[PDB]
Design a protein around this ligand. Structure first.
Ligand SMILES: [Fe+3]
Ligand SMILES: [Fe+3]
Ligand SMILES: [Fe+3]
Ligand SMILES: [Fe+3]
Lengths: 205, 205, 205, 205
């Protein structure tokens, strides 16, 4: 069923900001594990669904409840990393270039400048007390306004919050290169953020 | 698919400990809503499963993630209330009579007496800071030892924790009769707890 | 230390939308319990602070960790209900009258109309799967934009999210009058929401 | 106020199971940050306490609520890592030697063997979906029975759960050596677990 996506850059294309060593593990091992876990979880739930169809008991319901956590976690890991690679690019492919169009206008109007939005996001990233993510989002329910939200583990933004830029704050995203110095990673990553993709996501809603 | 279970007592059979007014609403309205929500949630997930089978995208994954919370919540509400009615009985049907067999032995060995186990459980119930449940459980992974655990909302015990007695701490479980005096409800309910059923659950594992 | 605030209306002043019976219990019992718990929690933490000052052990730290949950919960219950009464008013005191000034402008620009903002908030209230709150907020970090957020239990909005209108979704807020029909309560309460106060909160930031 | 504890082994004393490189960062950087954050958090709360003493407002309460998360997180990080080093030892100091006394008896009676308890704990560690910990505990409320519990982030065991062995599952605990292969780390660490200390903790309760 679900598979790893293809990359638009080889593993070392984001150096010196993110190492090829990190990207290789992050994609081939971490992302793949979420792919596998999500495939497995949805399979198990199909099976339990059929079991419940013939025997709709509290006992059968309990097992379904048990599996929904793995659907959430692995589904989240699958989708978050897909967002992540797609909002990263080498400088040679426009990584680090500022956003355009309606997204650029909204950023200036709401935050004053891109740098102010990046500062806010770095504060949110440093504030993740555990594993998690920060997302720059477009909120479709309050007039399409930008915000920045944190999630923990592989929780994600759904429904009316549209993700524009995802930034991974799990330690595996930086530890081999930056070790404990997560703030240096949060600072560096903007040099390869694909704001063209964020602008397209803002438009597509 | 899932339906409300039948009751072994008419709504007013647990008076003066739980009113007929409460039982009527709790069963016909609250439990039914969880039945409906669980049926609806599993349906939506079957649909999304088929959508993912043909198009395994991060976008399609996001929608599945979104629905798993309703599967957990409504599935939990369905199963918890099923446990609840089945561990309640009027005095005329042995409600309030102490447990028997291997459960009775474990209670005395671990807690000293039933009253001590009830005290602990009432402390756990009063400590639910929000809506939730206390469950007396048998833990299959540590040698079958008894414990008491709290859950919030419609979260439940799964896997190696076997529920023996479920006690509802949501305000709808008591408010019409006891209003804010939840401790009076926690005290009263033991008079109609079906420890015969708890003993059977302990044996069945 | 902290005490219950005074009310700007007698308990029955919000009828037929919220009963005097509910307001009496909600204020004299529920709010008072949070007042007491918050006072007690901060006292215990002062004591533990002094203990740690003389003996900064992991053991002493563990006890402080244990008490911070009661500070959060009771502190939240204290502050949320204070917000709540202050954003409610009888019709004779302007309850139900639409907001004014910069808040009114922001609502129309972001949501199209007050009714649309109320609809969104009612969706958020019905979506609280357990006990909790919805808050209409002003977000100071994204240019002062309005949003609506849910919290569970007595969790609250802090820091850059300024609460403008708080709506209690705990069952004790409605059960005596509406029982399970929470949607009827969410619909009715807007008739006595004090939008003058929300407008002042929006300005004061 | 709180400070880093002294180690009973130099950083490389747990090789080849945990590298000196990891221990150096884990102690000097990670643990120190929690020390600093806990000191800072308790200071801020003392200040807010005094502010509330003179002005017990919902506004002042909101700020205290805001700080309790940092007390929990950093307090937890401080205490968890203190537990951690104290339950690790080089083989030359008895690391890896089985527990003794009443703890050894309880393990055999409840789990059948130490290996079975270790297997269960490794399952719990691999099941932490994010950052967190597994703790082998003695539960004082159910007759002193052993169990294994998971926590997330720097959440900890408090009150009636006595921690006997703490095992860190944050990625920084293993990533430099094992990278994604967390199961290899969970397997290896038992070779340097200080079961003498766990046995003393079991006795001291
Ligand atoms: Fe990642
Ligand atoms: Fe219920
Ligand atoms: Fe309330
Ligand atoms: Fe650690």
């Amino acid at each position: 069923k679900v598979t790893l996506p293809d990359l638009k850059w080889d593993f070392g294309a984001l150096e010196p900001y993110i190492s090829g060593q990190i990207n290789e593990l992050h994609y081939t091992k971490h992302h793949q594990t979420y792919v596998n876990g999500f495939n497995t979880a949805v399979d198990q739930f199909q099976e339990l669904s059929d079991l419940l169809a013939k025997e709709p008991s509290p006992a059968n319901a309990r097992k379904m409840i048990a599996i929904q956590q793995n659907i959430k976690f692995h589904g989240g890991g699958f989708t978050n990393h897909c967002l992540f690679w797609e909002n990263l690019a080498p400088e040679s492919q426009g990584g680090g270039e500022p956003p355009t169009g309606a997204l650029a206008k909204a950023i200036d109007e709401q935050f004053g400048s891109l740098d102010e939005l990046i500062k806010l996001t770095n504060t949110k990233l440093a504030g993740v007390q555990g594993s998690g993510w920060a997302f720059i989002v477009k909120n479709l329910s309050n007039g399409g306004k930008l915000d920045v939200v944190q999630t923990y583990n592989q929780d994600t933004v759904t429904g009316p919050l549209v993700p524009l830029v995802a930034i991974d704050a799990w330690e595996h995203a930086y530890y081999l290169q930056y070790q404990n110095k997560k703030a240096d990673y949060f600072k560096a990553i903007w040099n390869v953020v694909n704001w063209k993709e964020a602008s397209r996501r803002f438009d597509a809603g």
